[PDB]
Amino acid sequence: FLKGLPVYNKSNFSRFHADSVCKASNRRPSVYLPTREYPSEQIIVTEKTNILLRYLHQQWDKKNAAKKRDQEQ
């Protein structure tokens, strides 16, 4: 059949109950007020070189290596 759905745990949703019908504006999660400072490992940065300027630069570096490998045939 279409059913036989995954089970990460049989206990999940086995004791769930809410004595209400179509009413739940409870924003139960307590808000997080961070006051402690913990440094970051990395810093996300963008490559400033233009995409065309980058392509023309590496293509010229590959064209030089094709001619600069003539010490040996």
Partner: protein, 424 residues
């Protein structure tokens, strides 16, 4: 199939996504006849309307009065007030290229910088330069030269500010003007690249590329030098009281002062890059065929990209040269004429230029020399179109042109942000 306007409006309420890019397929909201908004009609001069400004508040126009007596033209620029269905109200009148003798009718273009709305630039060029003779009918033209007229004018203020009128006239009512001659192959006009960096203009004068920056500063001393944070560089200051530029407010030249001035001062910067020096350096240091090189006959420079963040200018150097063929001997090794291209990145901050790519030598087996530049320019158009990335609206270079007096068709003046047309 086009969706109804009310259906689109309904969707905005429930989605919260409203943008001009979303409403692009939508027809214009309002289109007013030019005749209905213009005043003191009759035959009211020869006003050639250019178009809306990027802000959509100003509508520009110009006039080209000949004076049929000889004849030397006078070009005047105007700024009008758009108030939808109401009449246009003139806000600024300016004379362009003061004390300049214009023999032939100029093809002029008014431009705006991507984010600097405080000033506008006006390019102007003729088909050919005026000669030094006369052949009854007219003065005649020089087939080897062309005149280029560049001028920067300040935009009227949004309102208020420093109203220190010593009786009319104010703080930002400056004008700058220059003129240079060009040779064959006449440099290409690239306004989208030439003005990609705010307050700057890249000018091709055949012999070199000039980066000109014009800026005004007040009491504080935080921002200094746009260009150049060796090759030639000049920086001059002007207060009210190498391409030759003569400044003015609305009259004559303001007093050229120095750094010790207090109040308001204008700065003119010019960084030049000598083409022949660049060509010789690239061939000498980076060319693989440098040993075969003898001399170059002609060159043509085209801009490929301008990076306003890193202050880098990517140029392509089409070069006609004379060189010896490959060391292989099949007989007489007499030199031949070759065409090639050199790509160089020009750093505006440091002033140093770097070699990006060096082309191979293609033999010119008797080409018309005109076809060489026509083919080279097609490859530049091919390259730019190939690597074309759409930019943000409000970051574009607004180019305004109305070729009405030059055997040319303009019917609509559109403000594609407010969906407004001015039907001519």
């Amino acid at each position: 199939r086009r969706e109804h306007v009310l259906k689109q409006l309904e969707r905005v309420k429930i989605s919260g996504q409203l943008s001009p890019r979303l409403f692009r397929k939508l027809p214009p909201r309002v289109c007013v006849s030019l005749k209905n908004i213009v005043d003191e009609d009759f035959l009211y001069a020869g006003h050639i309307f250019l178009g809306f400004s990027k802000c959509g508040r100003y509508v520009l126009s110009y006039t080209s009065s000949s004076g049929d007596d000889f004849s030397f033209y006078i070009y005047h620029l105007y700024w009008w007030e758009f108030n939808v269905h109401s009449k246009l109200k003139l806000v600024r009148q300016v004379r362009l290229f003061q004390d300049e003798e214009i023999y032939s009718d100029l093809y002029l273009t008014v431009c705006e910088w991507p984010s600097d709305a405080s000033k506008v630039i006006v390019f102007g060029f003729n088909t050919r330069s005026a000669n030094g003779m006369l052949m009854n009918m007219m003065m005649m033209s020089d087939e080897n030269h062309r005149d280029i007229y560049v001028s920067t004018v300040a935009v009227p203020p949004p309102g208020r500010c420093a109203a220190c009128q010593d009786a009319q006239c104010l703080r930002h009512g400056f004008m700058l003007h220059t003129k240079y001659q060009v040779v064959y192959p006449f440099p290409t006009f690239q306004p989208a690249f030439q003005l990609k960096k705010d307050q700057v203009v890249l000018l091709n004068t055949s012999y070199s590329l000039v980066a000109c920056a014009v800026s005004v500063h007040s009491a504080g001393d935080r921002s200094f030098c746009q260009i150049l944070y060796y090759v030639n560089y000049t920086k001059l200051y002007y207060v009210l009281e190498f391409v030759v530029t003569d400044l003015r407010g609305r009259n004559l030249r303001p007093m050229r002062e120095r750094t010790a001035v207090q109040g308001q001062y204008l700065t003119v910067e010019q960084l030049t890059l000598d083409f022949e020096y660049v060509i010789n350096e690239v061939i000498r240091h980076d060319a693989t065929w440098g040993h075969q090189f003898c001399s170059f006959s002609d060159y043509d420079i085209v801009i490929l990209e301008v990076c306003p963040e890193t202050n880098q200018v990517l140029i392509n150097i089409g070069l006609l040269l004379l060189a010896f063929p490959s060391p292989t001997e099949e007989g007489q090794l007499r030199p031949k004429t070759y065409h090639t291209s050199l790509k160089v990145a020009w750093d505006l901050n440091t002033g140093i230029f770097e070699t990006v790519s060096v082309g191979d030598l293609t033999e010119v087996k008797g080409q018309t020399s005109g076809s060489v530049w026509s083919s080279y320019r097609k490859s530049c158009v091919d390259m730019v179109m190939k690597w074309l990335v759409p930019e943000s609206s409000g970051r574009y270079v607004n180019r305004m042109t109305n070729e009405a007096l030059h055997k040319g068709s303009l019917k609509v003046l559109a403000d594609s942000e407010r969906y407004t047309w001015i039907v001519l």
